[PDB]
């Protein structure tokens, strides 16, 4: 092992660059252009860092940031990398990067995954081998509240989820954020989310698991068609190390970060930089001088 702590700011430059590369193209509505631009910038900046990095979750295999791609000067620590150069469902757009020790992310097939996520206030209360109705009661009691005051947060993406929550007699609130941001919102200190629930891609679930572990929340996943459809994945089965760093930079304004903001010829980025080994959260605002 192991990746060093000092590599944090270096990762924050990567998402700042992706965001700055993408934001105009995304502002013109040219979504494919934004993605290419964000991706390219992410690749260039990852290559200025002294790591021996491997993309393990990313753009597919994509001509760029593909699965198994090598990035970094190739010197220093061996690390695994997950990228999401433009996450979000447009507003609530973020550039996201996660780097950790080799083997830190579970390698899951592009399969569906049922996801139950909580923050630190309800850690250790969940277990997808139990009925969702029981899980929701356990979480409510851990947060010191009646089931009637619990709200299940879901993503806008859906209608079978709302019905299941109607059948369970629980409030539901749909938020406009993507997966990673919603997971992060859930585990931030003083979060207003009680529990987060959904069905989505398994790789994206492993990425959420990595940030939730970093922030000391909790998660289970159930793969839906080591090992197969049906098995319940604990947090530590998906996020396999505490030594991960997450960097997320705002492209447009969302519930978690400000978008890139200009004042005369100065552009300011806002990045959340989460260090799982020390369990810390920073907000970094960088100055960029415009043309």
């Amino acid at each position: 092992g192991h990746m060093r702590r000092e590599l944090a700011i270096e990762f924050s430059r990567v998402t700042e660059s992706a965001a700055l590369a993408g934001y105009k193209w995304l502002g013109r509505g040219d979504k494919n252009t934004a993605d290419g631009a964000a991706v390219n910038a992410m690749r260039i900046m990852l290559n200025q860092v002294n790591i021996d990095g491997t993309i393990v979750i990313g753009e597919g295999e994509a001509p760029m940031l593909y699965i198994g791609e090598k990035v970094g000067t190739g010197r220093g620590d061996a690390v695994d990398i997950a990228v999401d150069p433009i996450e979000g469902t447009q507003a609530n757009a973020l550039a996201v990067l996660a780097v950790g020790d080799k083997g830190c992310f579970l390698n899951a097939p592009d399969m569906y995954m049922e996801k139950l996520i909580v923050g630190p206030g309800a850690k250790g209360t969940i277990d997808l081998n139990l009925p969702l109705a029981d899980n929701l009661r356990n979480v409510a009691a851990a947060l010191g509240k009646p089931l009637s005051e619990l709200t299940v947060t879901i993503l806008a993406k859906h209608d079978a989820v709302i019905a299941e929550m109607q059948q369970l007699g629980v409030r539901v609130f749909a938020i406009p954020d993507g997966d990673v941001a919603a997971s992060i919102l859930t585990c931030m200190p003083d979060s207003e989310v009680d529990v987060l629930y959904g069905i989505g891609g398994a790789p994206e679930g492993v990425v959420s698991a990595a940030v939730i572990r970093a922030l000391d929340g909790d998660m289970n996943g159930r793969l839906l068609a080591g090992i197969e459809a049906g098995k319940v994945l604990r947090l530590g089965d998906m996020a396999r190390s505490d030594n991960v760093i997450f960097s997320a930079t705002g492209i447009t304004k969302g519930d978690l970060l400000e978008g890139i903001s200009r004042k005369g010829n100065i552009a300011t980025t806002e990045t959340l930089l989460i260090r799982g080994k020390s369990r810390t959260i920073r907000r970094i605002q960088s100055i960029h001088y415009l043309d």
Side-chain angles (χ1 to χ4, degrees), residues 64-88 91-99:
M64 220 187 269
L65 302 193
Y66 53 83
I67 300 181
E69 186 180 6
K70 314 298 280 143
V71 292
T73 58
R75 289 187 319 271
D77 318 310
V79 289
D80 284 342
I81 294 182
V83 301
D84 193 358
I86 304 194
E87 140 150 327
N92 315 284
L94 258 27
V96 179
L97 172 66
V99 184

PDB file of all heavy atoms in Angstrom, residues 64-99, unseen atoms left out:
ATOM      1  N   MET A  64     -11.833   6.939 -23.773  1.00  0.00           N
ATOM      2  CA  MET A  64     -11.104   7.712 -22.771  1.00  0.00           C
ATOM      3  C   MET A  64     -11.659   7.524 -21.337  1.00  0.00           C
ATOM      4  O   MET A  64     -12.847   7.644 -21.071  1.00  0.00           O
ATOM      5  CB  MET A  64     -11.111   9.216 -23.172  1.00  0.00           C
ATOM      6  CG  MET A  64      -9.764   9.939 -22.926  1.00  0.00           C
ATOM      7  SD  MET A  64      -9.804  11.798 -23.214  1.00  0.00           S
ATOM      8  CE  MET A  64      -9.339  12.031 -24.957  1.00  0.00           C
ATOM      9  N   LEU A  65     -10.744   7.398 -20.391  1.00  0.00           N
ATOM     10  CA  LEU A  65     -11.059   6.940 -19.047  1.00  0.00           C
ATOM     11  C   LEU A  65     -11.927   5.688 -19.138  1.00  0.00           C
ATOM     12  O   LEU A  65     -13.023   5.592 -18.574  1.00  0.00           O
ATOM     13  CB  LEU A  65     -11.617   8.056 -18.186  1.00  0.00           C
ATOM     14  CG  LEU A  65     -10.633   9.256 -18.064  1.00  0.00           C
ATOM     15  CD1 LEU A  65     -11.050  10.166 -17.013  1.00  0.00           C
ATOM     16  CD2 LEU A  65      -9.215   8.855 -17.774  1.00  0.00           C
ATOM     17  N   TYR A  66     -11.355   4.717 -19.838  1.00  0.00           N
ATOM     18  CA  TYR A  66     -11.973   3.437 -20.005  1.00  0.00           C
ATOM     19  C   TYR A  66     -11.465   2.553 -18.879  1.00  0.00           C
ATOM     20  O   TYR A  66     -10.374   2.760 -18.367  1.00  0.00           O
ATOM     21  CB  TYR A  66     -11.641   2.828 -21.406  1.00  0.00           C
ATOM     22  CG  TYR A  66     -10.155   2.768 -21.751  1.00  0.00           C
ATOM     23  CD1 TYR A  66      -9.367   1.720 -21.308  1.00  0.00           C
ATOM     24  CD2 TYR A  66      -9.561   3.738 -22.555  1.00  0.00           C
ATOM     25  CE1 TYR A  66      -8.011   1.678 -21.582  1.00  0.00           C
ATOM     26  CE2 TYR A  66      -8.223   3.721 -22.823  1.00  0.00           C
ATOM     27  CZ  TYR A  66      -7.438   2.688 -22.330  1.00  0.00           C
ATOM     28  OH  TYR A  66      -6.078   2.618 -22.597  1.00  0.00           O
ATOM     29  N   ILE A  67     -12.204   1.489 -18.607  1.00  0.00           N
ATOM     30  CA  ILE A  67     -11.798   0.477 -17.647  1.00  0.00           C
ATOM     31  C   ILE A  67     -10.415  -0.116 -17.977  1.00  0.00           C
ATOM     32  O   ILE A  67     -10.174  -0.679 -19.058  1.00  0.00           O
ATOM     33  CB  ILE A  67     -12.862  -0.612 -17.563  1.00  0.00           C
ATOM     34  CG1 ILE A  67     -14.185   0.001 -17.118  1.00  0.00           C
ATOM     35  CG2 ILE A  67     -12.481  -1.684 -16.538  1.00  0.00           C
ATOM     36  CD1 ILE A  67     -15.330  -1.032 -16.990  1.00  0.00           C
ATOM     37  N   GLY A  68      -9.514   0.006 -17.020  1.00  0.00           N
ATOM     38  CA  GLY A  68      -8.188  -0.549 -17.138  1.00  0.00           C
ATOM     39  C   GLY A  68      -7.228   0.490 -17.650  1.00  0.00           C
ATOM     40  O   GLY A  68      -6.038   0.247 -17.675  1.00  0.00           O
ATOM     41  N   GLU A  69      -7.695   1.684 -17.973  1.00  0.00           N
ATOM     42  CA  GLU A  69      -6.765   2.690 -18.443  1.00  0.00           C
ATOM     43  C   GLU A  69      -5.790   3.091 -17.331  1.00  0.00           C
ATOM     44  O   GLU A  69      -6.192   3.194 -16.141  1.00  0.00           O
ATOM     45  CB  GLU A  69      -7.510   3.882 -19.002  1.00  0.00           C
ATOM     46  CG  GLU A  69      -6.552   4.860 -19.627  1.00  0.00           C
ATOM     47  CD  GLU A  69      -7.201   6.087 -20.221  1.00  0.00           C
ATOM     48  OE1 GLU A  69      -8.423   6.309 -20.088  1.00  0.00           O
ATOM     49  OE2 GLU A  69      -6.432   6.833 -20.840  1.00  0.00           O
ATOM     50  N   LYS A  70      -4.520   3.308 -17.711  1.00  0.00           N
ATOM     51  CA  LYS A  70      -3.496   3.776 -16.793  1.00  0.00           C
ATOM     52  C   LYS A  70      -3.403   5.245 -16.809  1.00  0.00           C
ATOM     53  O   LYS A  70      -3.312   5.886 -17.855  1.00  0.00           O
ATOM     54  CB  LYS A  70      -2.097   3.238 -17.111  1.00  0.00           C
ATOM     55  CG  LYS A  70      -2.012   1.728 -17.398  1.00  0.00           C
ATOM     56  CD  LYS A  70      -2.451   0.909 -16.209  1.00  0.00           C
ATOM     57  CE  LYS A  70      -1.315   0.825 -15.214  1.00  0.00           C
ATOM     58  NZ  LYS A  70      -1.853   0.868 -13.876  1.00  0.00           N
ATOM     59  N   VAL A  71      -3.309   5.813 -15.635  1.00  0.00           N
ATOM     60  CA  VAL A  71      -3.249   7.256 -15.564  1.00  0.00           C
ATOM     61  C   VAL A  71      -2.266   7.591 -14.484  1.00  0.00           C
ATOM     62  O   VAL A  71      -1.931   6.752 -13.660  1.00  0.00           O
ATOM     63  CB  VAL A  71      -4.666   7.876 -15.298  1.00  0.00           C
ATOM     64  CG1 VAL A  71      -5.590   7.672 -16.490  1.00  0.00           C
ATOM     65  CG2 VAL A  71      -5.319   7.258 -14.058  1.00  0.00           C
ATOM     66  N   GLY A  72      -1.778   8.803 -14.497  1.00  0.00           N
ATOM     67  CA  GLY A  72      -0.732   9.186 -13.577  1.00  0.00           C
ATOM     68  C   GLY A  72       0.624   9.177 -14.243  1.00  0.00           C
ATOM     69  O   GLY A  72       0.789   8.588 -15.272  1.00  0.00           O
ATOM     70  N   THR A  73       1.614   9.771 -13.609  1.00  0.00           N
ATOM     71  CA  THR A  73       2.997   9.716 -14.155  1.00  0.00           C
ATOM     72  C   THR A  73       3.484   8.275 -14.077  1.00  0.00           C
ATOM     73  O   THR A  73       4.602   7.930 -14.556  1.00  0.00           O
ATOM     74  CB  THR A  73       3.952  10.531 -13.302  1.00  0.00           C
ATOM     75  OG1 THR A  73       3.897  10.011 -11.963  1.00  0.00           O
ATOM     76  CG2 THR A  73       3.539  12.018 -13.180  1.00  0.00           C
ATOM     77  N   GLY A  74       2.712   7.425 -13.388  1.00  0.00           N
ATOM     78  CA  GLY A  74       3.106   6.028 -13.216  1.00  0.00           C
ATOM     79  C   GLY A  74       4.086   5.798 -12.084  1.00  0.00           C
ATOM     80  O   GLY A  74       4.383   4.636 -11.736  1.00  0.00           O
ATOM     81  N   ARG A  75       4.586   6.884 -11.503  1.00  0.00           N
ATOM     82  CA  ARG A  75       5.411   6.830 -10.321  1.00  0.00           C
ATOM     83  C   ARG A  75       4.530   6.805  -9.077  1.00  0.00           C
ATOM     84  O   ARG A  75       3.316   6.877  -9.193  1.00  0.00           O
ATOM     85  CB  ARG A  75       6.385   8.010 -10.333  1.00  0.00           C
ATOM     86  CG  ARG A  75       7.495   7.826 -11.425  1.00  0.00           C
ATOM     87  CD  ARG A  75       8.652   8.862 -11.456  1.00  0.00           C
ATOM     88  NE  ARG A  75       8.197  10.239 -11.246  1.00  0.00           N
ATOM     89  CZ  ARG A  75       7.796  11.072 -12.214  1.00  0.00           C
ATOM     90  NH1 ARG A  75       7.754  10.655 -13.472  1.00  0.00           N
ATOM     91  NH2 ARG A  75       7.363  12.310 -11.915  1.00  0.00           N
ATOM     92  N   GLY A  76       5.119   6.622  -7.900  1.00  0.00           N
ATOM     93  CA  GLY A  76       4.383   6.588  -6.647  1.00  0.00           C
ATOM     94  C   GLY A  76       3.419   5.404  -6.471  1.00  0.00           C
ATOM     95  O   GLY A  76       3.431   4.458  -7.231  1.00  0.00           O
ATOM     96  N   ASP A  77       2.498   5.548  -5.523  1.00  0.00           N
ATOM     97  CA  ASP A  77       1.556   4.481  -5.114  1.00  0.00           C
ATOM     98  C   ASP A  77       0.645   3.954  -6.201  1.00  0.00           C
ATOM     99  O   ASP A  77       0.124   4.715  -7.042  1.00  0.00           O
ATOM    100  CB  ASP A  77       0.661   4.969  -3.961  1.00  0.00           C
ATOM    101  CG  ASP A  77       1.423   5.778  -2.900  1.00  0.00           C
ATOM    102  OD1 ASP A  77       2.490   5.264  -2.456  1.00  0.00           O
ATOM    103  OD2 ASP A  77       1.001   6.907  -2.443  1.00  0.00           O
ATOM    104  N   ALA A  78       0.363   2.663  -6.121  1.00  0.00           N
ATOM    105  CA  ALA A  78      -0.642   2.057  -6.993  1.00  0.00           C
ATOM    106  C   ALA A  78      -2.013   2.330  -6.411  1.00  0.00           C
ATOM    107  O   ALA A  78      -2.273   2.010  -5.262  1.00  0.00           O
ATOM    108  CB  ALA A  78      -0.420   0.587  -7.116  1.00  0.00           C
ATOM    109  N   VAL A  79      -2.906   2.906  -7.212  1.00  0.00           N
ATOM    110  CA  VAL A  79      -4.264   3.220  -6.757  1.00  0.00           C
ATOM    111  C   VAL A  79      -5.295   2.844  -7.820  1.00  0.00           C
ATOM    112  O   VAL A  79      -4.953   2.713  -9.013  1.00  0.00           O
ATOM    113  CB  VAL A  79      -4.445   4.721  -6.448  1.00  0.00           C
ATOM    114  CG1 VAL A  79      -3.711   5.095  -5.219  1.00  0.00           C
ATOM    115  CG2 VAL A  79      -4.090   5.632  -7.649  1.00  0.00           C
ATOM    116  N   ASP A  80      -6.524   2.646  -7.346  1.00  0.00           N
ATOM    117  CA  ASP A  80      -7.698   2.467  -8.156  1.00  0.00           C
ATOM    118  C   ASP A  80      -8.569   3.695  -8.147  1.00  0.00           C
ATOM    119  O   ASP A  80      -8.702   4.371  -7.151  1.00  0.00           O
ATOM    120  CB  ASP A  80      -8.514   1.249  -7.719  1.00  0.00           C
ATOM    121  CG  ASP A  80      -7.842  -0.086  -8.179  1.00  0.00           C
ATOM    122  OD1 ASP A  80      -6.976  -0.045  -9.100  1.00  0.00           O
ATOM    123  OD2 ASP A  80      -8.102  -1.195  -7.675  1.00  0.00           O
ATOM    124  N   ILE A  81      -9.224   3.895  -9.264  1.00  0.00           N
ATOM    125  CA  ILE A  81      -9.860   5.147  -9.576  1.00  0.00           C
ATOM    126  C   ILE A  81     -11.257   4.942 -10.118  1.00  0.00           C
ATOM    127  O   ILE A  81     -11.482   4.115 -11.015  1.00  0.00           O
ATOM    128  CB  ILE A  81      -9.025   5.944 -10.595  1.00  0.00           C
ATOM    129  CG1 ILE A  81      -7.671   6.386  -9.980  1.00  0.00           C
ATOM    130  CG2 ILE A  81      -9.810   7.214 -11.049  1.00  0.00           C
ATOM    131  CD1 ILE A  81      -6.853   7.198 -10.941  1.00  0.00           C
ATOM    132  N   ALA A  82     -12.183   5.726  -9.597  1.00  0.00           N
ATOM    133  CA  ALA A  82     -13.494   5.818 -10.158  1.00  0.00           C
ATOM    134  C   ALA A  82     -13.764   7.268 -10.627  1.00  0.00           C
ATOM    135  O   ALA A  82     -13.564   8.214  -9.895  1.00  0.00           O
ATOM    136  CB  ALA A  82     -14.505   5.385  -9.156  1.00  0.00           C
ATOM    137  N   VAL A  83     -14.281   7.412 -11.843  1.00  0.00           N
ATOM    138  CA  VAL A  83     -14.534   8.712 -12.400  1.00  0.00           C
ATOM    139  C   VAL A  83     -15.940   8.867 -12.885  1.00  0.00           C
ATOM    140  O   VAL A  83     -16.575   7.911 -13.405  1.00  0.00           O
ATOM    141  CB  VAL A  83     -13.603   9.067 -13.593  1.00  0.00           C
ATOM    142  CG1 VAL A  83     -12.195   9.029 -13.159  1.00  0.00           C
ATOM    143  CG2 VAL A  83     -13.831   8.142 -14.767  1.00  0.00           C
ATOM    144  N   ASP A  84     -16.401  10.099 -12.729  1.00  0.00           N
ATOM    145  CA  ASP A  84     -17.694  10.509 -13.231  1.00  0.00           C
ATOM    146  C   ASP A  84     -17.597  11.972 -13.563  1.00  0.00           C
ATOM    147  O   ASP A  84     -18.047  12.836 -12.803  1.00  0.00           O
ATOM    148  CB  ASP A  84     -18.809  10.204 -12.242  1.00  0.00           C
ATOM    149  CG  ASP A  84     -20.150  10.339 -12.866  1.00  0.00           C
ATOM    150  OD1 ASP A  84     -20.211  10.721 -14.077  1.00  0.00           O
ATOM    151  OD2 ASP A  84     -21.193  10.115 -12.220  1.00  0.00           O
ATOM    152  N   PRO A  85     -17.029  12.230 -14.742  1.00  0.00           N
ATOM    153  CA  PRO A  85     -16.589  13.583 -15.135  1.00  0.00           C
ATOM    154  C   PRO A  85     -17.737  14.612 -15.141  1.00  0.00           C
ATOM    155  O   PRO A  85     -17.537  15.782 -14.762  1.00  0.00           O
ATOM    156  CB  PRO A  85     -15.980  13.350 -16.517  1.00  0.00           C
ATOM    157  CG  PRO A  85     -15.545  11.877 -16.443  1.00  0.00           C
ATOM    158  CD  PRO A  85     -16.676  11.223 -15.742  1.00  0.00           C
ATOM    159  N   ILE A  86     -18.933  14.161 -15.515  1.00  0.00           N
ATOM    160  CA  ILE A  86     -20.156  14.961 -15.365  1.00  0.00           C
ATOM    161  C   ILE A  86     -21.312  14.099 -14.857  1.00  0.00           C
ATOM    162  O   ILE A  86     -21.935  13.355 -15.627  1.00  0.00           O
ATOM    163  CB  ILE A  86     -20.554  15.667 -16.633  1.00  0.00           C
ATOM    164  CG1 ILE A  86     -19.403  16.553 -17.128  1.00  0.00           C
ATOM    165  CG2 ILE A  86     -21.842  16.551 -16.390  1.00  0.00           C
ATOM    166  CD1 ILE A  86     -19.822  17.528 -18.176  1.00  0.00           C
ATOM    167  N   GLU A  87     -21.564  14.230 -13.558  1.00  0.00           N
ATOM    168  CA  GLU A  87     -22.696  13.649 -12.863  1.00  0.00           C
ATOM    169  C   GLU A  87     -23.808  14.698 -12.719  1.00  0.00           C
ATOM    170  O   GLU A  87     -23.596  15.842 -12.306  1.00  0.00           O
ATOM    171  CB  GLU A  87     -22.274  13.123 -11.454  1.00  0.00           C
ATOM    172  CG  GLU A  87     -23.343  13.420 -10.399  1.00  0.00           C
ATOM    173  CD  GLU A  87     -23.509  12.474  -9.221  1.00  0.00           C
ATOM    174  OE1 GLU A  87     -23.319  11.232  -9.286  1.00  0.00           O
ATOM    175  OE2 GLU A  87     -24.034  13.039  -8.234  1.00  0.00           O
ATOM    176  N   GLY A  88     -25.029  14.298 -13.025  1.00  0.00           N
ATOM    177  CA  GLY A  88     -26.192  15.040 -12.561  1.00  0.00           C
ATOM    178  C   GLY A  88     -27.278  15.044 -13.575  1.00  0.00           C
ATOM    179  O   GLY A  88     -27.012  14.957 -14.802  1.00  0.00           O
ATOM    180  N   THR A  89     -28.505  15.224 -13.085  1.00  0.00           N
ATOM    181  CA  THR A  89     -29.716  15.056 -13.907  1.00  0.00           C
ATOM    182  C   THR A  89     -30.451  16.394 -13.960  1.00  0.00           C
ATOM    183  O   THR A  89     -31.671  16.424 -14.140  1.00  0.00           O
ATOM    184  CB  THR A  89     -30.639  13.931 -13.332  1.00  0.00           C
ATOM    185  N   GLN A  90     -27.293  21.072 -17.539  1.00  0.00           N
ATOM    186  CA  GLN A  90     -28.407  20.928 -16.606  1.00  0.00           C
ATOM    187  C   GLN A  90     -27.886  21.382 -15.256  1.00  0.00           C
ATOM    188  O   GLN A  90     -26.655  21.582 -15.122  1.00  0.00           O
ATOM    189  CB  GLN A  90     -28.885  19.468 -16.548  1.00  0.00           C
ATOM    190  N   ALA A  91     -28.814  21.587 -14.300  1.00  0.00           N
ATOM    191  CA  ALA A  91     -28.488  21.990 -12.923  1.00  0.00           C
ATOM    192  C   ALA A  91     -28.021  20.779 -12.151  1.00  0.00           C
ATOM    193  O   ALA A  91     -28.125  19.649 -12.630  1.00  0.00           O
ATOM    194  CB  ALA A  91     -29.695  22.601 -12.218  1.00  0.00           C
ATOM    195  N   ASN A  92     -27.534  21.009 -10.943  1.00  0.00           N
ATOM    196  CA  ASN A  92     -27.001  19.899 -10.127  1.00  0.00           C
ATOM    197  C   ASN A  92     -25.925  19.050 -10.831  1.00  0.00           C
ATOM    198  O   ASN A  92     -25.817  17.832 -10.649  1.00  0.00           O
ATOM    199  CB  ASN A  92     -28.174  19.020  -9.668  1.00  0.00           C
ATOM    200  CG  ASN A  92     -29.366  19.873  -9.136  1.00  0.00           C
ATOM    201  OD1 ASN A  92     -29.334  20.398  -8.031  1.00  0.00           O
ATOM    202  ND2 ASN A  92     -30.358  20.047  -9.958  1.00  0.00           N
ATOM    203  N   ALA A  93     -25.172  19.681 -11.707  1.00  0.00           N
ATOM    204  CA  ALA A  93     -24.053  19.012 -12.376  1.00  0.00           C
ATOM    205  C   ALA A  93     -22.761  19.136 -11.539  1.00  0.00           C
ATOM    206  O   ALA A  93     -22.482  20.197 -11.003  1.00  0.00           O
ATOM    207  CB  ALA A  93     -23.837  19.675 -13.707  1.00  0.00           C
ATOM    208  N   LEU A  94     -22.026  18.040 -11.401  1.00  0.00           N
ATOM    209  CA  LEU A  94     -20.795  17.939 -10.572  1.00  0.00           C
ATOM    210  C   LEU A  94     -19.775  17.119 -11.374  1.00  0.00           C
ATOM    211  O   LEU A  94     -20.170  16.161 -12.050  1.00  0.00           O
ATOM    212  CB  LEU A  94     -21.130  17.121  -9.324  1.00  0.00           C
ATOM    213  CG  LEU A  94     -21.384  17.713  -7.952  1.00  0.00           C
ATOM    214  CD1 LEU A  94     -21.892  19.071  -8.033  1.00  0.00           C
ATOM    215  CD2 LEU A  94     -22.368  16.813  -7.195  1.00  0.00           C
ATOM    216  N   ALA A  95     -18.497  17.370 -11.152  1.00  0.00           N
ATOM    217  CA  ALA A  95     -17.418  16.516 -11.638  1.00  0.00           C
ATOM    218  C   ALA A  95     -16.922  15.746 -10.440  1.00  0.00           C
ATOM    219  O   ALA A  95     -16.575  16.373  -9.466  1.00  0.00           O
ATOM    220  CB  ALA A  95     -16.343  17.374 -12.195  1.00  0.00           C
ATOM    221  N   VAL A  96     -16.809  14.426 -10.528  1.00  0.00           N
ATOM    222  CA  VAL A  96     -16.552  13.556  -9.375  1.00  0.00           C
ATOM    223  C   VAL A  96     -15.400  12.632  -9.677  1.00  0.00           C
ATOM    224  O   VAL A  96     -15.269  12.131 -10.779  1.00  0.00           O
ATOM    225  CB  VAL A  96     -17.806  12.694  -9.053  1.00  0.00           C
ATOM    226  CG1 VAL A  96     -17.552  11.766  -7.887  1.00  0.00           C
ATOM    227  CG2 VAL A  96     -19.053  13.573  -8.795  1.00  0.00           C
ATOM    228  N   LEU A  97     -14.577  12.417  -8.675  1.00  0.00           N
ATOM    229  CA  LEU A  97     -13.409  11.534  -8.714  1.00  0.00           C
ATOM    230  C   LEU A  97     -13.274  10.873  -7.358  1.00  0.00           C
ATOM    231  O   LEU A  97     -13.319  11.543  -6.318  1.00  0.00           O
ATOM    232  CB  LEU A  97     -12.135  12.358  -8.984  1.00  0.00           C
ATOM    233  CG  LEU A  97     -10.774  11.691  -8.890  1.00  0.00           C
ATOM    234  CD1 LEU A  97     -10.617  10.666  -9.950  1.00  0.00           C
ATOM    235  CD2 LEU A  97      -9.569  12.666  -8.861  1.00  0.00           C
ATOM    236  N   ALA A  98     -12.976   9.581  -7.379  1.00  0.00           N
ATOM    237  CA  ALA A  98     -12.605   8.845  -6.196  1.00  0.00           C
ATOM    238  C   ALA A  98     -11.349   8.023  -6.466  1.00  0.00           C
ATOM    239  O   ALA A  98     -11.266   7.319  -7.477  1.00  0.00           O
ATOM    240  CB  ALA A  98     -13.744   7.933  -5.727  1.00  0.00           C
ATOM    241  N   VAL A  99     -10.414   8.063  -5.526  1.00  0.00           N
ATOM    242  CA  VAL A  99      -9.144   7.371  -5.629  1.00  0.00           C
ATOM    243  C   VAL A  99      -8.933   6.690  -4.298  1.00  0.00           C
ATOM    244  O   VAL A  99      -9.112   7.307  -3.235  1.00  0.00           O
ATOM    245  CB  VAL A  99      -7.991   8.354  -5.922  1.00  0.00           C
ATOM    246  CG1 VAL A  99      -6.651   7.618  -6.138  1.00  0.00           C
ATOM    247  CG2 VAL A  99      -8.344   9.295  -7.115  1.00  0.00           C
TER     248      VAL A  99
END
